[PDB]
UniProtKB/Swiss-Prot annotation, chain C:
This is Portal protein. It comes from Salmonella phage P22 (Bacteriophage P22). The lineage of its organism: Viruses, Duplodnaviria, Heunggongvirae, Uroviricota, Caudoviricetes. It is found in: Virion. Signal peptide: none annotated. Forms the portal vertex of the capsid. This portal plays critical roles in head assembly, genome packaging, neck/tail attachment, and genome ejection. Procapsid assembly may initiate with a nucleation complex composed of portal and scaffolding proteins. The portal protein multimerizes as a single ring-shaped homododecamer arranged around a central channel. Switches upon genome packaging from an asymmetrical conformation in the procapsid (PC-portal) to a symmetrical ring in the mature capsid (MV-portal). This change of conformation may serve as a signal for headful packaging.
């Protein structure tokens, strides 16, 4: 079914982006934080008990 | 399209993932000055 | 190969294209997790 103009009507917004194994890689800011952030939460919870 | 190329493979050996479609093919550029040749004329337009 | 079954050429370019919406989309939708939801994962109750 022929849609209008001459592009795919989907523009994509990225944060940090590039290729590696020739595989696509991107990420928001959040990625780096998840690691210590749970620790926070955890120690938190532990101390709560 | 039924030939399927191959090459030294730029990725790696490891292979703990979900991509096995190598399908590598290379483009080879080469360069030479060669000293090719000639052919001059006269501008028929307004002289010069 | 030559197999001009339409839904086969199409489902075999998505299926070929989601093996990557794998390795990456796996991490991606999960940030949407540590954020828009709890930062705890995989255990309930």
């Amino acid at each position: 079914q022929l849609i209008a103009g001459e592009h795919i009507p989907i523009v994509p917004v990225f944060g940090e982006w590039g290729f590696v194994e020739d595989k696509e890689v991107y990420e928001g800011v959040v990625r780096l934080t998840k690691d210590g952030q749970r620790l926070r939460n955890m120690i938190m919870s532990f101390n709560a008990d | 399209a039924d030939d399927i190329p191959s090459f030294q493979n730029p990725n790696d050996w490891v292979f703990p993932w979900l991509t096995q479609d190598t399908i590598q093919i290379a483009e080879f550029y080469e360069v030479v000055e060669k000293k090719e040749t000639a052919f001059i004329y006269q501008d028929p337009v307004t002289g010069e | 190969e030559n197999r001009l079954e339409s839904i086969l050429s199409r489902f075999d370019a998505d299926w070929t294209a989601s093996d990557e919406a794998r390795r990456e989309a796996k991490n991606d939708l999960f940030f949407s997790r540590v954020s828009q939801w709890d930062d705890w994962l995989s255990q309930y109750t």
